[PDB]
Design an enzyme around this catalytic site. Sequence first.
Site, PDB file in Angstrom:
ATOM      1  CG  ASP A  10      -1.821  -1.164   1.228  1.00 41.23           C
ATOM      2  OD1 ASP A  10      -1.982  -1.670   0.311  1.00 41.23           O
ATOM      3  OD2 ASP A  10      -2.437  -1.597   2.227  1.00 41.23           O
ATOM      4  N   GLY A  11       1.837   1.433  -0.968  1.00 34.66           N
ATOM      5  CA  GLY A  11       2.700   2.394  -1.218  1.00 34.66           C
ATOM      6  C   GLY A  11       3.995   1.908  -0.920  1.00 34.66           C
ATOM      7  CB  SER A  44       1.310   7.047   1.394  1.00 39.18           C
ATOM      8  OG  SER A  44       0.198   6.225   2.384  1.00 39.18           O
ATOM      9  NE  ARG A  45       0.319   2.885  -4.044  1.00 43.84           N
ATOM     10  CZ  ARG A  45       0.444   1.911  -4.836  1.00 43.84           C
ATOM     11  NH1 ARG A  45      -0.489   1.354  -5.236  1.00 43.84           N
ATOM     12  NH2 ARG A  45       1.764   1.774  -5.291  1.00 43.84           N
ATOM     13  CB  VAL A  46      -3.742   6.095   3.062  1.00 38.79           C
ATOM     14  CG1 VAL A  46      -4.686   4.618   2.712  1.00 38.79           C
ATOM     15  CG2 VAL A  46      -2.440   5.768   3.716  1.00 38.79           C
TER      16      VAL A  46
END
Lengths: 57, 89, 473, 506, 51
Positions: free
Chosen positions: D346-347, D371-373
């Site tokens: 996730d990143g 980062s995916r978030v």
Amino acid sequence: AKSAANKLDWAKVISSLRITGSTATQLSSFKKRNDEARRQLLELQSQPTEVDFSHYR
Amino acid sequence: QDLYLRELKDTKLAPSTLQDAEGNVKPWNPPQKPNLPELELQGPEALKAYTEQNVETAHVAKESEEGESEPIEEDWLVLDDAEETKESH
Amino acid sequence: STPITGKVTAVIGAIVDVHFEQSELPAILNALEIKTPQGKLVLEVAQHLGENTVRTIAMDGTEGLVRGEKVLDTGGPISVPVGRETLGRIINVIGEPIDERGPIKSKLRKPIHADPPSFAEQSTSAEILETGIKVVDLLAPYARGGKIGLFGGAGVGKTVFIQELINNIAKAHGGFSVFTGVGERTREGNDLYREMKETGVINLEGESKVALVFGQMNEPPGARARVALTGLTIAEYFRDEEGQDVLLFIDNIFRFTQAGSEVSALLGRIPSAVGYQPTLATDMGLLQERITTTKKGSVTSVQAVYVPADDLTDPAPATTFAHLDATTVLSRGISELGIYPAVDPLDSKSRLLDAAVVGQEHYDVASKVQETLQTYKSLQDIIAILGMDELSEQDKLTVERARKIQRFLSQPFAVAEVFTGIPGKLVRLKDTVASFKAVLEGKYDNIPEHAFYMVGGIEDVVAKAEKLAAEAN
Amino acid sequence: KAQPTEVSSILEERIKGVSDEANLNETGRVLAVGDGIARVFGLNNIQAEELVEFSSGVKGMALNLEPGQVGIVLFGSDRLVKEGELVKRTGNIVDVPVGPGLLGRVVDALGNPIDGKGPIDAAGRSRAQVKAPGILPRRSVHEPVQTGLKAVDALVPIGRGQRELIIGDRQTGKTAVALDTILNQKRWNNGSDESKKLYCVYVAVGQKRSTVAQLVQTLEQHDAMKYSIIVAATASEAAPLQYLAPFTAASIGEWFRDNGKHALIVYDDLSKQAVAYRQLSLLLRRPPGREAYPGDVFYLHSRLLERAAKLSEKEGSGSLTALPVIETQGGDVSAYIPTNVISITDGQIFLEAELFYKGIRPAINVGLSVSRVGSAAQVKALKQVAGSLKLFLAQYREVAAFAQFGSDLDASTKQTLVRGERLTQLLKQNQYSPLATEEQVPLIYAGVNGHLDGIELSRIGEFESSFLSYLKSNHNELLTEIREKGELSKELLASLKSATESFVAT
Amino acid sequence: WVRYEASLRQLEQRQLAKSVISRVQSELGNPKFQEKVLQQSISEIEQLLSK
Ligand SMILES: Nc1ncnc2c1ncn2[C@@H]1O[C@H](COP(=O)(O)OP(=O)(O)OP(=O)(O)O)[C@@H](O)[C@H]1O
Ligand SMILES: Nc1ncnc2c1ncn2[C@@H]1O[C@H](COP(=O)(O)OP(=O)(O)OP(=O)(O)O)[C@@H](O)[C@H]1O
Ligand SMILES: [Mg+2]
Ligand SMILES: [Mg+2]
């Protein structure tokens, strides 16, 4: 207290614009920050000066 | 069964005198007693320093004084030097 | 007891298959025996094939091996002499004295294959070993209880660096040293033997402080893969039984993995990447984990690695990177640039280079040197095509300072004076850090860049500049 | 010490009791043993992946269940094993003990206490191959993980249950960020609020025992070992043990995750996991795939990593954050395992040696490190309240986008140049010095209202330290208010701006 | 004074390791090897009779 001690130090820096080349007043302020900074570190690292007769013994 | 009991018994013959009792040790030629409890009892303090930090030398802090309590010969000189600075200030 | 006896069935290159009898199967990694006319041929067992048949590795050439010859089991792993008597005696992969100085009178004999010393491991990463070489002391200090890199391709001067280390460290040190010498030229071994004889490190009728193991490329792959473990066994005996600081030396660890790949193909395993053995990391870790600081004692091991075709991404060098703290790459480009040693300062790298251990001033000096040298590499492409005149003034200052520095990293060696004509010199750490900081500050920028070549301290640079301005210009 | 003697006596009596209660007949016979591999005739009803005991005392896992003879890998050396040895069956799939007594201890892949501090108090025993949580029994990541690294906090946020990869080259600082996060968690690990506790669990697959010794010495020096668990698989151990260790540590963390707590796993150097799996598959005569790796390494990594998740309130709202580490050869992120792991996480956090030698100690390539978030899993004080902490990513992209090719045209370009270079010199940090959000906010907030007036580049570091001093002294109210409430209110923005400009005039 | 005690714990187990050598050398010189086969015979009877 700690913030009060240097609160009046921000008064002398304003007073320092008219008085340029202060040999030791800033050094005394530096000295009163050097020892005081040594104070907070000293007390925070200060464990209770004892040996745990219950556990550590 | 016996083959465990006998080795359990064997634990009560060879190492019984080793640490369970203090009958020194039969198989070993070197002794067991004058190594750990007398020579190595000071071993922990043979690894660290003795009579200075195990005794811990609870020493009175060296006392520092003020500016010799002699203001007159310096305050006026500082005052005279304050005149010199403020001319340059 | 009854001698365990069997029949040889297959002889495949360096691989021999032996069929045994009822419940007579030997152990893995256990020495066997063939009575050859020349002498003794041992067959280390590698794998079990079943049906009372075992696959073995020959430590000598398999010439004249007839199927069905009588074999004899030793009863354990290869045993080699161990003790202070081995000092001054040149031994082999099996342990026979090849120095023809009489039989070895060893008191103990230990198995070759041991196990890592569990978690009885200390970590004293604070002993900066003073080497003398300017470049290594600054950017990658050598630890007294660590493992030393020495990477590089063919003819990059790794063996000369090893000779310099054995000249500067072994002489002034209290503690035994072991040179294994895996798969190098016998000429190099002969020169090294002679030189230790004249220097006095080993006396034929004296004390001797080095145990000489030797396995060259003339040995078959099995011997070239076992001789490193044989030398390591001597090192382990001296660290444990004697409780001394041992100074293990090899010549090439890549030959060990190369011989493993040699035997793997005929051993019957699926080839790994670029034709290596599947058990590369495992075997190499087994070899390089026994060499450790070992709470009761300490060891320094100056490893030496050959990169195939100057490929730093080759599986064996890439894997052995992880098991070393202080490394030295010895890039070739520096070699054709003429800067000897040809170590690349941008890839040397070590753990000990931290402000707590080496000092804040040394850390800052090394960091600024790294910056100055890295700016040059960053601007190389622009400089190569366009030229330095297309750069900014700050870029010009940085690139000329970098040129001066990278020329100043060179240092004469007391071993390679024949290849330089300049007597070897040694520089202390405090001297070289001060000299580098002085050059970094810009105190010496009017000095010609050529004055930094083959010199020691900054005073030598000043003297060389004085001569260059005197007669040359 | 007579007590261990009777302890061993009762140990031996239950040893006899357990041994002489089997009367097994399917106990197989070893046909041949290879390099850590042993085909065995027998075990007709053996389960897959099931543990075994050899008569010598070495464990083994049932990989291949082809008819007739069974492929058994070895947890240890083939040193003591021969042909024709009776192989004991455990009756259960390979398992690892789990519990709260693990904290402060160092164990091996199986879970045996290897540090030498006595036995392990385990509250349970979980499988090494457990199924990842489903699509519903989970919740999105909202709570942020405070790394203590300003470049890893304000630029590439991570939170409870995400999967951030430390991709990079050798000795670039890959372990540094992980250990810094572990040290940083001490701030809340010493309190009472369990929703903010982050116990740390760390894997050591392939690293030499000296390195893990230095590491554990490190965590005990900074007093972080009390909430950390170290599982070690040195290169000396057999390939099966290294291949198994990360799964066992995943189960260890999943214990906390399912018990409602929060934990952090560092999958350090997951590449040697892949090479150990390569050795396993090749030694089992399993057909290899691309560049001699086994085909199902993508599945291997997916099953391992996706076990980390943020659970929903129904099951207990637990979490498990994966922190894997991958080393690349010469910066080649197009390599097979690097591509798989960059596609699995996730990143990522890119680190390269070039910025490391440029002076940037974190060496975070903000161009690739993503980062995916973003807003989610980030403290609000480092967010829209600070305003630009929503959009420093664009600013650092443009400052790199006009270095010489986008040469300075007008005063705006010069201002952006100075701003960017001052910031890049500001983001520098030193190892073993974690920082906190309440003093992240002032430093980067000063990066928008007065940063070009910093006192020359070589002296912006003590500028940030003195700014921190001027805000911890005489200004503790700001630091507090922003540290409990976690965001900057309008009056709080005014006070922060006033303080920043006051020290700017200073 | 703690890790010295801890080292005292570790060293004590170490001479117990060589004590087993003294123990195991006592194990190999007995007629119990003749008597021990009867132990299996009674034990294996108790084993399968349970089933
Ligand atoms: N310090 C030095 N000064 C001068 N010449 C040097 C120095 N170091 C190495 N050389 C030169 O480098 C060349 C190769 O030296 P050396 O035998 O050490 O190579 P190597 O890298 O160890 O070789 P190989 O790959 O065959 O083991 C020789 O021509 C030698 O003179
Ligand atoms: N912030 C920092 N300040 C100073 N030195 C640092 C910093 N970060 C990393 N280093 C140094 O960089 C080197 C590598 O860092 P680290 O220990 O994290 O290794 P790594 O990148 O995980 O590599 P490996 O895969 O070899 O273990 C070490 O010498 C370490 O001291
Ligand atoms: Mg050479
Ligand atoms: Mg690391």
